[PDB]
Amino acid sequence: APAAVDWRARGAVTAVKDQGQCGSSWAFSAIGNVECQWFLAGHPLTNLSEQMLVSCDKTDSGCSGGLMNNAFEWIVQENNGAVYTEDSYPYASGEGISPPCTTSGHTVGATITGHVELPQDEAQIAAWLAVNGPVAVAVDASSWMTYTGGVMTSCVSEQLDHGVLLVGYNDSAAVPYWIIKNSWTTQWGEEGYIRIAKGSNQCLVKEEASSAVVG
Numbered sequence: 001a002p003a004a005v006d007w008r009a010r011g012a013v014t015a016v017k018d019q020g021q022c023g024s025s026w027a028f029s030a031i032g033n034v035e036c037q038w039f040l041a042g043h044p045l046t047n048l049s050e051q052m053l054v055s056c057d058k059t060d061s062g063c064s065g066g067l068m069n070n071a072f073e074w075i076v077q078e079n080n081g082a083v084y085t086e087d088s089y090p091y092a093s094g095e096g097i098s099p100p101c102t103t104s105g106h107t108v109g110a111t112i113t114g115h116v117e118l119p120q121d122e123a124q125i126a127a128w129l130a131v132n133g134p135v136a137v138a139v140d141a142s143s144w145m146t147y148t149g150g151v152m153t154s155c156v157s158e159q160l161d162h163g164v165l166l167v168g169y170n171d172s173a174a175v176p177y178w179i180i181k182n183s184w185t186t187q188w189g190e191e192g193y194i195r196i197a198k199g200s201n202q203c204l205v206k207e208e209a210s211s212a213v214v215g
């Protein structure tokens, strides 16, 4: 794998979003992954619908949590790989209560055919990320509410509770870091992003790494 990758620079990552008071980071992690993969497959960068997942993926628990891998399985097995646009299935869960599932009225903006799980190895994850793009990972975000900037070096790494998106890394820096897209608006962290140290399993970043497959 190359020394440093940033898929934001390649135009592969959509704007930072806001999950609100909903426990739907799993859906932002999953949708954000799909968005990137969709683009990297030659299709236009498209905003896709977390609310689609929150309302309809009954394999997960809407505003009360879920798993990226479930979402990936749900999209393929229950929705024919279909992922609707953000515009046509906009987010309505900011106050923590999701509207129920709807089918009509939404426009299919992307398709996936499955997913892969990555090993619990940061070198291997970086290897995959270098070739195939942004990875969906679960982390411990307990120590994240007070992050301002810089590279988090001793993140509380005790229990996974939050889904995010690895959009890149940098092994050349003084403290090697992952670049992570979060869903807590752009006011948080570094314009909605956080850099955590790479190699010491900060926040348990490597425990649940996976990615949708497009085409």
Ligand SMILES: Cc1nn(C)cc1C(=O)Nc1nc2ccccc2[nH]1
Pocket: 019, 020, 021, 022, 023, 024, 025, 026, 064, 065, 066, 067, 068, 138, 139, 160, 161, 162, 163
């Ligand atoms: C369960 C679960 N598993 N995974 C991978 C993520 C979750 C989850 O509920 N995350 C989540 N809830 C939040 C509530 C408020 C702000 C941010 C929040 N993030």
